[PDB]
Design a protein around this ligand. Structure first.
Ligand SMILES: NC(=O)C1=CN([C@@H]2O[C@H](COP(=O)(O)OP(=O)(O)OC[C@H]3O[C@@H](n4cnc5c(N)ncnc54)[C@H](OP(=O)(O)O)[C@@H]3O)[C@@H](O)[C@H]2O)C=CC1
Ligand SMILES: NC(=O)C1=CN([C@@H]2O[C@H](COP(=O)(O)OP(=O)(O)OC[C@H]3O[C@@H](n4cnc5c(N)ncnc54)[C@H](OP(=O)(O)O)[C@@H]3O)[C@@H](O)[C@H]2O)C=CC1
Ligand SMILES: NC(=O)C1=CN([C@@H]2O[C@H](COP(=O)(O)OP(=O)(O)OC[C@H]3O[C@@H](n4cnc5c(N)ncnc54)[C@H](OP(=O)(O)O)[C@@H]3O)[C@@H](O)[C@H]2O)C=CC1
Ligand SMILES: NC(=O)C1=CN([C@@H]2O[C@H](COP(=O)(O)OP(=O)(O)OC[C@H]3O[C@@H](n4cnc5c(N)ncnc54)[C@H](OP(=O)(O)O)[C@@H]3O)[C@@H](O)[C@H]2O)C=CC1
Lengths: 459, 459, 459, 460
């Protein structure tokens, strides 16, 4: 009751813990409640003022954060977020998810996450540059290639990463794998831009395969996507590559959907145009008036994709946390949606998830809508970041195939761990699909909890 | 609106800012609103998990904090608090006060403050020792004799300081002035135990002197005190030494008042007995049944001193923040109280302070009740801590007189700065006393704001 | 022939070397030839890029430097010069001079200097803050309160030291005597602003009083000063204070001379008005169109004051290196000047020095021109600077008086040491004044040469 | 402006780069890179220091020490250490400047640096060297590291000397790490490092010869004029002989040693080993005037470079030191029918010589032309395998001799190819004319580095 209310974090915690309860995990390993208690308080958090100069010469204040939540499995590893709503509660939820997502890679990476309430919108390239310079001045001392390795998230693209790296290098006089999402000439890995959205799809391929006994694929499926950022961009491109039709994309202002969802789609070209806007930080709203887009797409301001795509098969929330409500989950089920995986960390509201797992428990095999949590599906990104670290570590640069091969292995291993661990610790009824949320949460939590015990963080 | 609500901090901020507004400060120096904005975001904050072992062998979790709020004037300097209600909001308010209190010493000390929600009650000496060992393991890396110099506060006595020092020494392989409130054989300063409560009194001597033109002193005054800790203990002992009668003391459970407040008092003996209990962490409640105390004192459970001491002249809240309500301030005025200085940081509720300054504005000269804020009156302690640092720095140990001399200088200089700066920037009406809160807040804030400008924290 | 030609350095070196040569020193200490070889190669030098941003958002490149020449007698100590003339040669003469000057103060201080070719002229206060910030981002690692302590020289005042310090604190998370010449409230020392200037005058009191057997002092003396900066200003104000008439200041654009040199003088108010223009980085030329100056003075663009004063008794070169030519020295001689001390570092050319010593060998007693080197007369600045370090390490602030007192003492012993050493090692003919420069050199030099030997820096 | 010391060797290499960038569409397409050109040519950091050390007689001795940390956008600082009485800031700036870009071309993450000292190894006993290296590293190590700056060897700094520095580094830093390259086998070195630079030159030219003749010729049958007789010169020569080429010249700082019959005759590997031995002893090549074996077969030419005394010759490999090919000398090589010339040595050809070889490439179509390849493209093999030492030390393993030779060969193919293809995009040559390797090598190295610098906020 001394503790401040952190609702975004509490959500994250309660889903995880709840899935741990509704399982025979604590019957077999009662001691794990002590591990859950310990792990939930972060190892370390750094908060810090960031003072920076806008183009008009005026002095600006913003709030730096870096949650270093658990380094049992590896160095702290996790993205950076620049968005006006950024607080502790939020970066704590991401840091917490990140712990356990990172475990499912089978690479040695701890959970962390940081960022700022700095808003990159309205801001010049120069203003963003200064801000990164001041942000990295303070963050510099708490991070490092064997300590904590940040990367991007909402608002932190490879460009911001560039400015952050350059300043890290100035300060510490060291060239090392201290950041991921880096550009190719200077310690970047091939596949990293693509890795998150690729990962999601690769994971749903396996969900579909198993759900339908190899009958169906993304081949000719209708796929609603939300957001239009690095995740959703390359999620959409892979759906197309496997013959899927991407029927929707969105931003902060609205969703943009093909008028004929039954048969029409986005194209690599159209996506590349939306990418260009989000380097310049413009909204989708700007390109709906052009000829190519006006005839083909409806643009719905203030509206999310889910309830206006009609019939649809796969759903990939890739914008932000809490962007699929229970109103909106029921609508997807009713539109015959039978696969939903989170591109975005905590994309689904509890209420939505409660409809999805209730449905899976009520309907047999392929008749079920199958939810996969973000820590299982958007793990591709962080997993390649590990490969980036390893590349830097070994002091060489691997080929795109070499990496995409390893990404495929790792997304598959992660589906198989969630699935097997769901059958083992919370066996579904006859003909019912294992809980992918529960098995992923349990598999992640167990590997962590035991490594913490071995090391002495708890007894 | 992303920002979490931190009410203990917001209070601290709003009083300070309000006093800055109700003054011609921002007319003369409008730029200072930018300094107020910058200074209010802390330079750095470290939060960290603390895992420790109780005597029964079981694993325990608690929350470590260290607010490093402003290092403009000097290294971060500020106490450590172990109390169950400890959160960020709270340690931020103390850290914020500490910035500006420290400025009024004229020694080079930044504002900081840290602690834990660790509760020392119910706890063995061994349990406290382990906890300090684990607490200092993490705090070790963020602190140092030229960086940040902690000390005590509620729950952190010289004993806890001992355990913290020993572990700092183990870890960093360094013997330095990294902590204050240290014991004599190992870098302690003479007068430090006594310095805070001594300081308060020394400050009220000057309030009384000026208020009454040197007519009155603590000589035969009735002095209600709250709390029974290191502040209130040596506050009470100095009141007696100057011929004052200490009529009240309190703890968490209740207040303990002499049955005859008009003519009776506590004694150095009786106080030394109450001290012994608070090394062992027992309550006042335990010694009311003995012969000496049963006949002499009434003990009122759950009740604060203020409204049950009858007539009374001086009030010294020395327990904790927000322990004098407006209900309770009016009661003091009505009982002819004409001096109130805060031993405890933010001891008075706004509502109380609003009655006190309203009264001073309504009634002329000595007919006024005169409030002095904690940052002006409990500065004695931190000021000697500086002397402790200097002693360590010069590598020698000064005599008790040498120190008490410097303490006297420094408490007086601080009254004179509050007074002069109140007359200058917010001149009272004719025959009305300067605001000691406003002048102390302004004098503290200005020295800081200008040092920040010079250094480039703002422009 | 691999060595780059560094004219500024090899001068400082040849005058030093020839004075040692033109003495008995090498007869009784031939091993010291080896000491000269070693000392005159700097222990460490740091060169660096300083990328910074102007007010237009435009990228700007400048060259940073730190010359860490000798640390046998203490941590490197030196000022920072921001002037377009800056190269390695200029900093290497200043850094080398500083060795031996610091040796004459009696304090423990090495010989350092640095800066950059960045020119503060043109620049906004914004642009200086920004250069300063980027400047110290690189410098920071190479310095520290026990390692190397920089300060001001030409174009680095307390304003710039402010920006520098504040960045260094932000970078090293440490508050220390890393820079001297700091503001009062953040580790500054009283009498710094005034130190170098007063010191020059104080030194020359002892020169006057010796040469004239105490008959003349600075009262009713006519004094020509060059420069209008820190050294110049406060020397002028001191000469004025001691009954003297200051007939000249100057800057980069021209001299400013009283029309009536025989009877008239500069005033405090006129000096305080120029100082205000130098604070604002303006020229003397700005004010030649005023009541305040038009009638009383005569602006002389692109000349130095020496030839245009005629009636003159003392010359205080206080601007920059080699600002007194062979021809100009003869003018001063011809015009009856008897005393000349370098306020500026290496103020006089070898041609000019030679004339002053040829004259000193040529005329008995007060009838000669006495030349004092900078390393002796301008040592008040660095001496008090070391008393600022002393105060920072004692965590305390000394009085105006206490410092001035130390200053006068230090300067008296500097004169005395120089005088006696010249008397021992290069005894002048009957009646002839001892060589203050040959003395001052052999004095500083032998202390460092011995310190080195002891320490194994040579054998 | 006019405060800066006149640094001739640094300014030379600055100009050859700047001018080659101007003579292309690089600044038409990306005009902003003029800013980067200005930012990059100022060193990031530089460290000068005294080096007090003790001679064999017990006498104190002084020398100047240098480390130039020019650019670190593409990696940590990387480049050798030079012990030569000529050494000064200027020289070491050219070397480090060259390095930024050379490293840019191996495709590995390495920034640019170099250092050394005016210490002169000639006449010093092995004991005196050991002591210097001790003093030298004592100041140096503060500023370097496996992830900070990785020195190595250049002229006057062999594996003997590397070892002294490594052992002192290990003491001082309490660390066994990949802080130096060109190390011994037992202790963190790599196979094919001794060989690397010279092999790397002859692999790069093997490609030049392939392009000019569409695979129809090789080093087979070619006469090859080589200068210097150190690490670069020795193993370049060994690889020529291996590929059926005739090495007709070697040289040193005193003189040149040429075969009497340049047409039909060549050096044997055994003779190269006998010289390589003389240089481990810091003894002059001159000493062979007195062995009948060599006197019969060779001609020593005290005070002459070999370029005008080889008769007709085909390939020229400067492998000694900078500016060792005059305007005059380069003309005579055109006259002899040399059609291939690669700098083994860093900035080995003069501006006169570069200007003559480029003007000639543009005057003559196909294999009539003489083809110049810069230092940064051809000798990149040293630092490429140097860069593989670090990759091996980081992974804590050792690689087979041919694992490294293969990795090397592939990098030189990439480097030749990068230079050719970049030159066609930005400085398209006329029809039938060979693309400018020096231009395309400089452009491609520069743009990688300057793109990285933009990305990292070094300029904007
Ligand atoms: N990049 C990565 O490697 C990984 C990302 N993720 C998660 O995926 C999600 C998106 O990441 P990423 O694509 O990198 O971020 P980007 O900034 O690249 O894109 C963000 C997208 O989400 C939209 N968006 C952001 N915040 C909100 C909001 N509060 N309400 C509505 N729309 C919003 C943005 O709209 P607009 O363009 O208008 O701002 C934009 O379309 C995040 O939750 C992130 O944590 C998870 C794993 C890896
Ligand atoms: N020590 C120092 O140098 C300085 C202290 N202060 C301030 O003075 C105050 C007291 O400090 P200190 O005496 O060192 O602390 P101590 O622990 O020595 O004593 C605390 C006293 O306050 C009582 N108390 C503590 N918390 C509460 C609460 N929440 N409600 C009611 N009573 C409470 C305690 O009762 P119990 O014994 O039952 O716990 C005890 O009587 C604090 O606000 C502190 O910040 C300010 C400047 C310097
Ligand atoms: N400050 C100190 O503590 C000490 C200073 N000194 C020496 O005193 C001299 C000046 O220092 P300081 O007074 O702080 O300098 P300031 O920057 O305070 O002022 C320097 C003055 O000299 C003039 N000046 C500067 N450069 C030149 C030039 N290249 N040609 C002609 N005139 C010039 C300037 O003209 P303008 O204002 O137009 O630029 C300015 O008025 C230096 O030699 C310095 O080493 C020595 C010991 C201590
Ligand atoms: N080490 C490597 O892997 C690399 C080397 N290089 C370049 O190769 C060249 C030599 O390297 P390396 O073989 O290691 O050096 P070595 O010292 O082993 O050999 C250098 C040769 O050059 C001669 N030489 C040295 N200085 C001069 C001079 N001033 N005038 C004429 N001849 C001279 C030497 O003659 P003497 O024996 O009489 O001194 C010696 O025969 C340099 O330009 C270097 O930059 C370039 C890239 C990588």
């Amino acid at each position: 009751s001394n503790l401040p209310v952190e609702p975004e974090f509490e959500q994250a915690y309660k889903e995880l813990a709840s899935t741990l309860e509704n399982s025979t995990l604590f019957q077999k390993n009662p001691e794990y409640r002590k591990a859950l208690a310990v792990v939930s308080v972060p190892e370390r958090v750094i908060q810090f003022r960031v003072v920076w100069e806008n183009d008009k010469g005026e002095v600006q204040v913003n709030r730096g954060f870096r949650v270093q939540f658990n380094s049992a499995l590896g160095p702290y590893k996790g993205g950076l977020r620049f968005h006006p709503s950024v607080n502790l509660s939020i970066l704590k939820f991401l840091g917490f998810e990140q712990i356990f997502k990172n475990a499912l890679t089978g690479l040695n990476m701890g959970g962390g996450k940081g960022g700022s309430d700095f808003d990159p919108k309205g801001k010049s390239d120069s203003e963003i540059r200064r801000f990164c310079v001041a942000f990295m001045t303070e963050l510099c001392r708490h991070i490092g290639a064997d300590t904590d390795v940040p990367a991007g998230d909402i608002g932190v693209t490879g460009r911001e990463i560039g400015y952050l790296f350059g300043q890290y290098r100035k300060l510490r006089n060291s060239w090392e794998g201290v950041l991921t999402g880096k550009g190719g000439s200077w310690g970047g890995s091939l596949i990293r831009p693509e890795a998150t959205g690729y990962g999601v799809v690769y994971y749903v391929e396996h969900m579909i395969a198993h759900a339908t006994n190899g009958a169906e694929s993304f081949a000719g499926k209708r796929v609603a996507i939300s957001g239009s950022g690095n995740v959703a961009q390359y999620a959409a491109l892979k759906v197309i590559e496997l013959g899927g039709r991407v029927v929707s994309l969105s931003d902060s202002q609205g969703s943009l959907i093909v008028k004929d969802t039954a048969k029409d789609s986005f194209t690599p070209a159209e996506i590349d145009a939306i990418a260009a806007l989000k380097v310049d930080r413009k909204q989708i709203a700007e390109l709906v008036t052009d000829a190519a887009f006006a005839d083909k797409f409806t643009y719905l301001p203030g509206q999310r994709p889910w309830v206006h795509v009609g019939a649809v098969d796969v759903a990939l929330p890739s914008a932000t946390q809490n962007e699929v409500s229970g109103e909106e989950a029921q609508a997807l089920i009713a539109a015959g949606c039978k696969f939903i995986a989170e591109g975005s960390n905590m994309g689904c509201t509890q209420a939505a998830i409660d409809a999805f797992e209730a449905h899976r428990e009520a309907n047999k095999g392929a008749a079920a809508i199958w939810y996969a949590p973000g820590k299982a599906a958007n793990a591709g990104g962080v997993a390649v970041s590990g490969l980036e670290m390893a590349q830097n570590s070994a002091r060489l640069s691997w080929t795109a195939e070499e990496v995409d091969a390893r990404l495929k292995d790792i997304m598959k291993s992660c589906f198989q761990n969630g699935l097997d661990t769901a059958k083992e610790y919370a066996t579904p009824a006859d003909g019912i699909l294992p809980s992918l949320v529960t098995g992923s949460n349990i598999a992640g939590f167990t590997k962590v909890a035991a490594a913490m015990k071995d090391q002495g963080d708890w007894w």
